[PDB]
Short mmCIF file of C-alpha atoms and ligand atoms in Angstrom, two decimals:
data_model
loop_
_atom_site.label_atom_id
_atom_site.label_comp_id
_atom_site.label_asym_id
_atom_site.label_seq_id
_atom_site.Cartn_x
_atom_site.Cartn_y
_atom_site.Cartn_z
CA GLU V 2 20.08 -10.89 -3.38
CA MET V 3 16.92 -8.76 -3.39
CA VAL V 4 14.88 -10.89 -0.98
CA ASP V 5 14.36 -9.42 2.50
CA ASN V 6 15.38 -5.94 1.34
CA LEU V 7 12.40 -4.30 3.07
CA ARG V 8 12.03 -3.38 6.73
CA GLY V 9 9.44 -1.42 8.62
CA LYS V 10 7.49 -0.65 11.75
CA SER V 11 3.90 -1.91 11.63
CA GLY V 12 1.47 0.84 10.63
CA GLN V 13 4.32 3.11 9.55
CA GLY V 14 5.10 1.68 6.14
CA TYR V 15 7.82 -0.44 4.55
CA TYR V 16 11.15 0.99 3.41
CA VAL V 17 14.09 -0.03 1.23
CA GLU V 18 17.68 1.19 1.43
CA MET V 19 18.76 3.64 -1.26
CA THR V 20 21.59 6.07 -1.84
CA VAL V 21 21.38 9.54 -3.33
CA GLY V 22 24.10 11.83 -4.62
CA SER V 23 27.82 11.57 -5.33
CA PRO V 24 29.38 10.29 -3.20
CA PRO V 25 26.41 8.12 -2.11
CA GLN V 26 24.33 9.24 0.87
CA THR V 27 22.42 6.34 2.42
CA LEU V 28 18.74 6.86 3.25
CA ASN V 29 15.83 4.56 4.09
CA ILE V 30 12.96 5.18 1.68
CA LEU V 31 9.32 4.18 2.13
CA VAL V 32 7.97 2.20 -0.82
CA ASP V 33 4.69 3.76 -1.93
CA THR V 34 2.61 2.41 -4.82
CA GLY V 35 0.02 5.05 -3.94
CA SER V 36 1.95 8.10 -5.16
CA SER V 37 4.44 9.12 -7.82
CA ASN V 38 6.98 11.49 -6.29
CA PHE V 39 10.44 10.53 -5.05
CA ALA V 40 11.11 12.82 -2.09
CA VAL V 41 13.60 12.87 0.77
CA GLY V 42 14.11 14.84 3.95
CA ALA V 43 16.70 17.47 3.04
CA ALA V 44 16.80 19.54 6.22
CA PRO V 45 16.85 18.75 9.96
CA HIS V 46 13.63 17.45 11.49
CA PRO V 47 12.96 16.15 15.03
CA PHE V 48 11.93 12.77 13.61
CA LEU V 49 14.74 12.51 11.04
CA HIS V 50 17.83 10.46 11.91
CA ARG V 51 19.54 11.88 8.82
CA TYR V 52 18.78 13.86 5.68
CA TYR V 53 19.85 14.54 2.09
CA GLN V 54 22.62 17.14 1.98
CA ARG V 55 22.64 18.54 -1.54
CA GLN V 56 25.72 20.70 -1.02
CA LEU V 57 27.75 17.51 -0.49
CA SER V 58 26.72 16.01 -3.84
CA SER V 59 28.66 17.07 -6.94
CA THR V 60 26.06 15.45 -9.19
CA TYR V 61 23.05 17.32 -7.83
CA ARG V 62 21.36 19.55 -10.40
CA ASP V 63 18.87 22.19 -9.23
CA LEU V 64 15.64 22.38 -11.26
CA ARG V 65 14.72 25.75 -9.76
CA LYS V 66 11.11 24.78 -9.09
CA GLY V 67 9.14 24.22 -5.90
CA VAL V 68 6.83 21.29 -5.22
CA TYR V 69 4.10 20.46 -2.71
CA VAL V 70 2.44 17.09 -2.04
CA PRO V 71 -0.61 16.65 0.25
CA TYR V 72 -1.33 13.00 1.08
CA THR V 73 -4.32 11.57 2.91
CA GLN V 74 -1.99 11.60 5.92
CA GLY V 75 0.67 14.31 6.00
CA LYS V 76 2.07 16.82 3.54
CA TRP V 77 5.42 18.26 2.53
CA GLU V 78 6.97 20.98 0.41
CA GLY V 79 10.38 21.11 -1.18
CA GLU V 80 12.68 21.94 -4.07
CA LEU V 81 13.03 19.88 -7.23
CA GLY V 82 16.34 18.71 -8.64
CA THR V 83 17.97 15.60 -10.09
CA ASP V 84 20.76 13.39 -8.79
CA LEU V 85 22.19 9.89 -9.00
CA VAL V 86 20.35 7.16 -7.13
CA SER V 87 21.18 3.51 -6.46
CA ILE V 88 19.52 0.66 -4.59
CA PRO V 89 22.17 -1.37 -2.73
CA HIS V 90 19.95 -4.43 -2.31
CA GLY V 91 17.95 -3.96 -5.50
CA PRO V 92 19.03 -4.06 -9.17
CA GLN V 93 22.70 -3.14 -9.52
CA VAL V 94 22.16 -0.06 -11.67
CA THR V 95 22.59 3.65 -11.00
CA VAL V 96 20.16 6.16 -12.47
CA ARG V 97 19.70 9.91 -12.55
CA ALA V 98 16.25 10.66 -11.20
CA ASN V 99 14.03 13.53 -10.13
CA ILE V 100 14.24 14.19 -6.39
CA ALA V 101 12.10 16.46 -4.24
CA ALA V 102 14.23 17.84 -1.41
CA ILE V 103 11.79 18.22 1.48
CA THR V 104 12.41 21.45 3.38
CA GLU V 105 9.11 21.72 5.25
CA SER V 106 6.58 19.09 6.32
CA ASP V 107 3.49 18.56 8.49
CA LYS V 108 2.54 15.23 10.08
CA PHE V 109 4.51 13.41 7.38
CA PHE V 110 7.65 12.08 9.06
CA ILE V 111 6.88 9.58 11.82
CA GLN V 112 8.69 9.35 15.16
CA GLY V 113 10.82 6.20 15.22
CA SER V 114 9.90 4.92 11.75
CA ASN V 115 13.52 4.71 10.55
CA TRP V 116 12.78 6.09 7.07
CA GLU V 117 13.75 9.50 5.71
CA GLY V 118 12.01 9.70 2.36
CA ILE V 119 9.37 8.20 0.11
CA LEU V 120 9.44 6.44 -3.27
CA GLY V 121 6.29 6.97 -5.31
CA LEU V 122 6.03 3.98 -7.63
CA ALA V 123 2.80 5.00 -9.41
CA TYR V 124 2.42 6.83 -12.72
CA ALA V 125 3.30 10.33 -13.88
CA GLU V 126 -0.36 11.36 -14.12
CA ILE V 127 -0.51 11.92 -10.35
CA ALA V 128 3.00 13.31 -9.91
CA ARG V 129 3.34 16.87 -8.59
CA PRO V 130 3.68 19.59 -9.78
CA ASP V 131 2.39 17.85 -12.92
CA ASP V 132 2.84 14.83 -15.19
CA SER V 133 6.01 16.16 -16.79
CA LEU V 134 7.95 15.16 -13.67
CA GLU V 135 9.13 11.68 -14.63
CA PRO V 136 8.64 9.24 -11.73
CA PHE V 137 11.59 7.19 -10.47
CA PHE V 138 10.56 3.81 -11.86
CA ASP V 139 10.05 5.27 -15.33
CA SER V 140 13.57 6.70 -15.20
CA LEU V 141 14.88 3.36 -14.00
CA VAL V 142 13.37 1.47 -16.92
CA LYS V 143 14.42 4.07 -19.50
CA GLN V 144 18.01 4.20 -18.31
CA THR V 145 18.66 0.53 -17.54
CA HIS V 146 17.75 -2.83 -19.05
CA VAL V 147 15.32 -3.67 -16.24
CA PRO V 148 11.97 -5.20 -17.26
CA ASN V 149 9.00 -2.91 -16.65
CA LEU V 150 7.62 -4.69 -13.57
CA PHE V 151 8.18 -4.94 -9.84
CA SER V 152 6.64 -7.03 -7.09
CA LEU V 153 6.05 -6.57 -3.37
CA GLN V 154 5.95 -9.15 -0.60
CA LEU V 155 4.98 -7.31 2.58
CA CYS V 156 5.21 -9.53 5.65
CA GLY V 172 10.03 -7.12 6.82
CA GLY V 173 9.48 -8.04 3.21
CA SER V 174 10.87 -7.94 -0.32
CA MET V 175 10.70 -5.59 -3.26
CA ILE V 176 11.80 -7.41 -6.41
CA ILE V 177 12.46 -5.15 -9.38
CA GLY V 178 12.40 -6.49 -12.91
CA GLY V 179 10.82 -9.86 -12.30
CA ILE V 180 8.89 -12.40 -10.27
CA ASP V 181 10.43 -14.48 -7.49
CA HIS V 182 8.66 -17.83 -7.20
CA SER V 183 10.22 -18.48 -3.80
CA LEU V 184 8.01 -15.68 -2.50
CA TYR V 185 4.61 -17.24 -3.16
CA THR V 186 2.67 -20.47 -3.40
CA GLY V 187 -0.17 -21.53 -5.68
CA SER V 188 -1.35 -19.54 -8.68
CA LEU V 189 -0.92 -15.88 -9.60
CA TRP V 190 -4.24 -14.25 -10.50
CA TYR V 191 -4.29 -10.99 -12.47
CA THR V 192 -6.61 -8.02 -12.47
CA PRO V 193 -6.31 -5.22 -15.06
CA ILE V 194 -4.82 -1.86 -14.27
CA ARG V 195 -7.87 0.12 -15.34
CA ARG V 196 -5.96 3.32 -15.96
CA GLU V 197 -2.33 4.25 -15.43
CA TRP V 198 -2.33 6.95 -12.78
CA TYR V 199 -2.79 5.28 -9.43
CA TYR V 200 -2.63 1.53 -9.69
CA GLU V 201 -6.38 1.54 -10.24
CA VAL V 202 -8.32 -1.72 -10.18
CA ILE V 203 -11.95 -2.84 -10.10
CA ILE V 204 -13.71 -4.68 -7.28
CA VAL V 205 -16.77 -6.58 -8.52
CA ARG V 206 -18.04 -8.16 -5.30
CA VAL V 207 -17.51 -8.07 -1.55
CA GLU V 208 -18.46 -10.85 0.85
CA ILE V 209 -18.23 -11.10 4.64
CA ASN V 210 -18.41 -14.60 6.10
CA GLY V 211 -19.38 -15.62 2.57
CA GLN V 212 -22.37 -13.29 2.53
CA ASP V 213 -22.68 -10.77 -0.31
CA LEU V 214 -22.93 -7.12 0.76
CA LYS V 215 -25.44 -6.88 -2.08
CA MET V 216 -24.63 -3.47 -3.52
CA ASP V 217 -24.38 -2.33 -7.11
CA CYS V 218 -20.73 -3.11 -7.81
CA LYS V 219 -19.98 0.47 -8.88
CA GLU V 220 -20.35 1.42 -5.22
CA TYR V 221 -17.19 -0.59 -4.46
CA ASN V 222 -15.18 1.66 -6.79
CA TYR V 223 -16.58 5.11 -6.06
CA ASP V 224 -14.55 7.34 -6.58
CA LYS V 225 -11.92 4.78 -7.69
CA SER V 226 -10.17 1.72 -6.20
CA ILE V 227 -6.38 1.62 -5.78
CA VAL V 228 -3.57 -0.66 -4.59
CA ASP V 229 -1.48 1.40 -2.19
CA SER V 230 1.49 0.11 -0.18
CA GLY V 231 1.82 3.57 1.35
CA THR V 232 -1.52 3.42 3.18
CA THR V 233 -2.01 1.26 6.27
CA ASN V 234 -5.72 0.42 6.27
CA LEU V 235 -8.23 -1.10 3.93
CA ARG V 236 -10.19 2.08 3.25
CA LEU V 237 -13.72 1.81 1.84
CA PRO V 238 -16.27 4.26 0.37
CA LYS V 239 -18.75 5.42 3.01
CA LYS V 240 -21.66 3.26 1.82
CA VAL V 241 -19.49 0.14 1.57
CA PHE V 242 -17.72 0.82 4.86
CA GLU V 243 -20.98 1.15 6.78
CA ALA V 244 -22.35 -2.04 5.23
CA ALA V 245 -19.12 -3.90 5.98
CA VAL V 246 -19.12 -2.81 9.63
CA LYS V 247 -22.74 -3.84 10.06
CA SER V 248 -21.88 -7.30 8.75
CA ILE V 249 -18.70 -7.73 10.79
CA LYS V 250 -20.53 -6.59 13.95
CA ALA V 251 -23.22 -9.16 13.19
CA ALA V 252 -20.69 -11.97 12.77
CA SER V 253 -18.78 -11.04 15.93
CA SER V 254 -21.86 -10.22 17.99
CA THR V 255 -20.92 -12.64 20.76
CA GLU V 256 -18.76 -9.77 22.00
CA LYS V 257 -19.71 -6.08 22.03
CA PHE V 258 -17.13 -3.37 21.43
CA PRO V 259 -17.26 0.43 21.84
CA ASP V 260 -18.26 2.47 18.79
CA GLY V 261 -14.82 4.06 18.97
CA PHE V 262 -13.27 0.72 18.04
CA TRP V 263 -15.27 0.45 14.81
CA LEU V 264 -14.25 4.05 14.07
CA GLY V 265 -10.66 2.88 14.28
CA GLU V 266 -9.99 5.34 17.08
CA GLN V 267 -9.63 3.17 20.19
CA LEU V 268 -8.06 -0.21 20.94
CA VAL V 269 -9.64 -3.52 21.84
CA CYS V 270 -7.49 -5.65 24.15
CA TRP V 271 -7.50 -9.28 25.28
CA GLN V 272 -5.33 -11.07 27.82
CA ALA V 273 -2.11 -11.99 26.01
CA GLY V 274 -2.60 -15.00 23.76
CA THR V 275 -6.39 -15.12 23.99
CA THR V 276 -7.48 -13.08 20.96
CA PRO V 277 -10.80 -14.68 19.82
CA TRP V 278 -9.90 -14.82 16.13
CA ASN V 279 -12.70 -17.26 15.38
CA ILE V 280 -15.49 -14.81 16.18
CA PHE V 281 -14.38 -12.42 13.43
CA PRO V 282 -15.34 -13.10 9.79
CA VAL V 283 -13.23 -13.55 6.68
CA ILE V 284 -13.59 -10.82 4.08
CA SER V 285 -13.49 -11.63 0.37
CA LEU V 286 -12.71 -8.97 -2.21
CA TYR V 287 -13.50 -10.14 -5.75
CA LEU V 288 -11.36 -8.44 -8.39
CA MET V 289 -12.13 -8.17 -12.10
CA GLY V 290 -10.32 -10.81 -14.14
CA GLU V 291 -8.55 -10.42 -17.48
CA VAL V 292 -11.47 -12.12 -19.25
CA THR V 293 -15.05 -10.86 -19.60
CA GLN V 294 -17.24 -11.41 -16.53
CA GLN V 295 -14.60 -13.56 -14.84
CA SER V 296 -13.18 -12.67 -11.44
CA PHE V 297 -11.07 -14.08 -8.63
CA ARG V 298 -11.12 -13.34 -4.92
CA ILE V 299 -8.57 -12.44 -2.32
CA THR V 300 -9.62 -13.41 1.19
CA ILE V 301 -8.53 -11.59 4.31
CA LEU V 302 -8.51 -12.97 7.86
CA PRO V 303 -9.02 -10.92 11.03
CA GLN V 304 -5.29 -11.33 11.69
CA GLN V 305 -4.92 -8.95 8.75
CA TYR V 306 -7.63 -6.37 9.50
CA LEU V 307 -7.17 -6.26 13.27
CA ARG V 308 -3.81 -4.48 13.43
CA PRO V 309 -1.63 -5.18 16.49
CA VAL V 310 -0.53 -2.08 18.39
CA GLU V 311 2.73 -2.65 20.26
CA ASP V 312 3.00 -0.89 23.62
CA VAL V 313 5.01 -2.19 26.56
CA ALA V 314 2.56 -0.40 28.88
CA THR V 315 -0.37 -2.56 27.72
CA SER V 316 1.70 -5.68 27.15
CA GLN V 317 -0.08 -7.89 29.68
CA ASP V 318 -2.63 -7.82 26.84
CA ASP V 319 -2.69 -8.04 23.07
CA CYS V 320 -4.38 -4.89 21.77
CA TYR V 321 -5.60 -4.07 18.27
CA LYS V 322 -6.99 -1.30 16.13
CA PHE V 323 -9.70 -1.98 13.55
CA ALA V 324 -7.80 -1.39 10.30
CA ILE V 325 -10.79 -1.02 8.03
CA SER V 326 -11.87 2.61 7.77
CA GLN V 327 -13.99 5.05 5.80
CA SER V 328 -12.94 6.88 2.65
CA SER V 329 -14.43 9.69 0.58
CA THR V 330 -11.84 9.25 -2.18
CA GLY V 331 -12.56 5.65 -3.11
CA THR V 332 -11.27 2.26 -2.03
CA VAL V 333 -7.67 1.99 -0.88
CA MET V 334 -6.22 -1.50 -0.64
CA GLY V 335 -3.46 -0.67 1.79
CA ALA V 336 -0.81 -2.64 3.62
CA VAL V 337 -3.18 -4.79 5.66
CA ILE V 338 -4.64 -6.08 2.40
CA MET V 339 -1.23 -6.56 0.74
CA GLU V 340 0.39 -8.29 3.71
CA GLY V 341 0.40 -12.05 3.25
CA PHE V 342 0.06 -11.71 -0.50
CA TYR V 343 2.71 -11.52 -3.18
CA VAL V 344 1.66 -8.60 -5.36
CA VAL V 345 3.06 -8.23 -8.87
CA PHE V 346 2.85 -4.78 -10.43
CA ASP V 347 3.11 -5.88 -14.05
CA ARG V 348 3.33 -2.47 -15.69
CA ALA V 349 4.38 -3.95 -19.03
CA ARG V 350 1.11 -5.86 -19.35
CA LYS V 351 -0.98 -3.30 -17.47
CA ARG V 352 -2.11 -5.75 -14.79
CA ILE V 353 -1.70 -6.53 -11.09
CA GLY V 354 -1.08 -10.09 -9.95
CA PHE V 355 -1.95 -11.58 -6.56
CA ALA V 356 -0.75 -14.84 -5.07
CA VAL V 357 -0.64 -16.26 -1.55
CA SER V 358 2.61 -15.15 0.07
CA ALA V 359 5.19 -17.40 1.68
CA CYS V 360 4.86 -15.17 4.76
CA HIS V 361 1.14 -14.70 5.49
CA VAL V 362 -0.30 -14.78 9.02
CA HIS V 363 -3.04 -17.29 9.85
CA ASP V 364 -4.04 -20.09 12.22
CA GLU V 365 -4.89 -23.79 12.33
CA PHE V 366 -8.48 -23.23 11.13
CA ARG V 367 -8.44 -20.69 8.30
CA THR V 368 -5.98 -19.50 5.67
CA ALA V 369 -5.88 -16.37 3.49
CA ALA V 370 -6.38 -17.22 -0.17
CA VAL V 371 -6.30 -16.04 -3.77
CA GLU V 372 -8.62 -18.18 -5.83
CA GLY V 373 -10.93 -18.41 -8.81
CA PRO V 374 -12.43 -18.33 -11.37
CA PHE V 375 -15.85 -16.89 -10.55
CA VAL V 376 -18.36 -15.99 -13.25
CA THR V 377 -21.05 -13.30 -13.17
CA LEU V 378 -24.30 -13.20 -15.14
CA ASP V 379 -24.91 -9.47 -14.74
CA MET V 380 -22.88 -7.68 -17.41
CA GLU V 381 -22.73 -4.26 -15.72
CA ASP V 382 -19.38 -2.45 -15.79
CA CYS V 383 -18.30 -1.96 -12.19
CA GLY V 384 -16.06 0.96 -13.06
CA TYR V 385 -17.39 4.22 -11.72
CA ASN V 386 -15.70 6.28 -14.44
C1 VG6 R 1 2.29 4.27 6.39
C2 VG6 R 1 1.74 5.47 7.17
N1 VG6 R 1 0.29 5.33 7.35
C3 VG6 R 1 -0.67 5.91 6.55
C4 VG6 R 1 -0.37 6.66 5.38
C5 VG6 R 1 -1.41 7.24 4.60
C6 VG6 R 1 -1.11 8.02 3.40
O1 VG6 R 1 -1.74 9.03 3.07
N2 VG6 R 1 -0.06 7.58 2.68
C7 VG6 R 1 0.41 8.27 1.48
C8 VG6 R 1 1.88 8.74 1.62
C9 VG6 R 1 2.51 8.54 2.98
C10 VG6 R 1 3.33 7.43 3.32
C11 VG6 R 1 3.89 7.34 4.62
C12 VG6 R 1 3.64 8.34 5.59
C13 VG6 R 1 2.82 9.45 5.26
C14 VG6 R 1 2.27 9.54 3.97
C15 VG6 R 1 0.02 7.54 0.17
O2 VG6 R 1 0.75 8.03 -0.93
C16 VG6 R 1 -1.45 7.79 -0.16
N3 VG6 R 1 -1.88 7.19 -1.42
C17 VG6 R 1 -3.08 7.84 -2.02
C18 VG6 R 1 -2.96 9.35 -2.22
C19 VG6 R 1 -3.86 10.22 -1.55
C20 VG6 R 1 -3.76 11.62 -1.73
C21 VG6 R 1 -2.77 12.17 -2.57
C22 VG6 R 1 -1.84 11.32 -3.26
C23 VG6 R 1 -0.73 11.91 -4.20
F1 VG6 R 1 -0.73 11.26 -5.36
F2 VG6 R 1 0.44 11.76 -3.60
F3 VG6 R 1 -0.91 13.21 -4.45
C24 VG6 R 1 -1.97 9.90 -3.07
C25 VG6 R 1 -2.76 7.08 5.01
C26 VG6 R 1 -3.08 6.33 6.18
N4 VG6 R 1 -4.39 6.19 6.56
C27 VG6 R 1 -5.31 7.33 6.69
C28 VG6 R 1 -6.49 6.78 7.48
C29 VG6 R 1 -6.47 5.27 7.24
C30 VG6 R 1 -5.01 5.01 6.86
O3 VG6 R 1 -4.51 3.89 6.84
C31 VG6 R 1 -2.02 5.76 6.94
#
């Protein structure tokens, strides 16, 4: 009953239905493995269809404390409290959880996104104001019998809480360690484009850190890695020349509807650290994943795309365009992240996204930046 419980607009995140307060107030909530605060619009906003009305909830308790969260994109401020929360198409349990009532925001809410709040599924260490603010999922596990694990299939999509749904993937699940419980931090040991190694010290791939983040759209890479990746993708696709603005992820590239030259763009392989010494596996991404379609009736004689790999100064972010087409298991109990090929990945008659291994490495260097 939990399958297909996610919806979204491409590039604007995936959300699940929740209710807050007594009696229940229904809100759509973006599912974000890249942060740790549960926050909802709680005052009118031009982009909000509805908002949390605390005065209508008898179970709301005010914590008398402000809170501010600045993301990579957007920021909000609000007031902390607790209230009862349920997930109509998730586990059938109700829990009292911390809630940030958003009273002011900047470039956070998105016009036409259909969500009104955000659910930070990461660990308390990155919660604001500090790590004493118990995140939602921790409250859920403490207060119910739900196993300490959830999984995401981003396609619509599914968030499965408490277990793994085999109907949602094919082949084997491969696991990489959660290096530290704050973000869902992982370690990338190798990157290949078109099968060719980028040939960098593997610590470069994880400077400052590397995270798995359903709340970010792009694959974001450290400057040095990004520039190397772009050079290699340009080389592979050199039969066509695009404006610099495209590689900067600023402007679109368009082709006559139906004629996107997928075959001229390379596959990208990210090798993740395995659970055993010097073993790894790879996840492979097709251009259908990293060239993000931009819907616009005005340009609809064409198919137009943005380049959804972009530069970061805060480490690697494996965002939605990496997670789409994979079934991703956040196995908190065993401190590991699993990847498998999703039942709903996008590909063609020539190439298919994959999760595969094992791969061994002779060089024993720790790829963690520290
Ligand atoms: C889905 C919308 N598209 C996005 C969203 C975000 C982004 O910053 N997402 C946030 C939250 C968010 C979710 C939805 C809307 C707005 C914010 C996520 O928590 C960051 N994790 C990491 C993080 C970073 C900083 C602070 C935190 C903290 F923990 F919350 F404090 C977390 C970056 C994008 N970018 C930017 C350029 C490339 C790209 O794809 C595109």
